[PDB]
Amino acid sequence: SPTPVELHKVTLYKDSGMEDFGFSVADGLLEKGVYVKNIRPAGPGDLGGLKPYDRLLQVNHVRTRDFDCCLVVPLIAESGNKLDLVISRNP
Length: 91
Known about the structure:
By secondary structure, this protein is an alpha+beta fold. It has two helices and six strands; from the N terminus they run βββαββαβ. The protein has helices at 44-48, 69-77; strands spanning 6-13, 23-27, 34-39, 55-59, 62-63, 82-89. A hairpin with a 2-residue loop joins strand 4 and strand 5. The PDB classes it as protein binding.
């Protein structure tokens, strides 16, 4: 809990013209990967359940755990009208 993240399935919905799904991510340079840096309060991300630090593990079945921001950013906006992914955050 104090650190050991916890996997949590999340799903969202994008809009024809949005630049993101409702939350920006950051490249985890402390090891490898990317985690949500900020989510729109009361938005798709908040409605889905994305909690700060939610390190996107698998995006739409694609294991983007060892991916980078440049790969997670597009993968997020490339999911289409919906973003189904499995993230990990410390409770």
